Design a binder for this molecule. Structure first.
Ligand code: 38E
Ligand code: CA
Length: 126
């Protein structure tokens, strides 16, 4: 069924990521249900350069195993990440996405900031 993956989400997940620059991150995603198919997300964590992660976004069912994710990170100059989480097990999801925007928060979009940058990761049920 289309909501089988969504039904697992409500609550807190441990999240680890890797970006295209070679950095890693650790933190949490918290899902708040808004319907059988949609969730609100808040995000916290730290990048391997020490920078804090603060974000909020939304999840929407796409297939029985996947959900579309859009997250904005105020702690990272309001960069926008868009991607999909794919169910791997009842307690694990895989993350594949890309982001762009004023990551360094200086108010100007540099070349590194102008195009999409890859983001991969894993979510583990806590
Ligand atoms: C661990 C974690 N990293 C997140 C985002 C994130 C991680 C990164 F390594 C980035 O370069 C970046 F632009 C965003 C997130 O929301 N969580 C929970
Ligand atoms: Ca910038």
């Amino acid at each position: 069924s289309m909501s089988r993956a969504a039904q697992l989400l409500p609550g807190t997940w441990q999240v680890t990521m890797t970006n295209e620059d070679g950095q890693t991150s650790q933190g949490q995603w918290h899902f708040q249900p808004r319907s059988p198919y949609t969730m609100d997300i808040v995000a916290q964590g730290t990048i391997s350069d020490g920078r804090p992660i603060v974000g909020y976004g939304k999840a929407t069912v796409k297939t029985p195993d996947t959900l579309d994710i859009d997250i904005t990170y105020p702690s990272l100059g309001n960069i926008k990440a868009q991607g999909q989480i794919t169910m791997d097990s009842p307690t694990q999801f895989k993350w594949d996405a890309h982001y762009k925007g004023d990551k360094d928060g200086d108010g100007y979009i540099s070349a590194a900031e102008a195009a999409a940058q890859g983001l991969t990761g894993t979510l583990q049920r806590q």
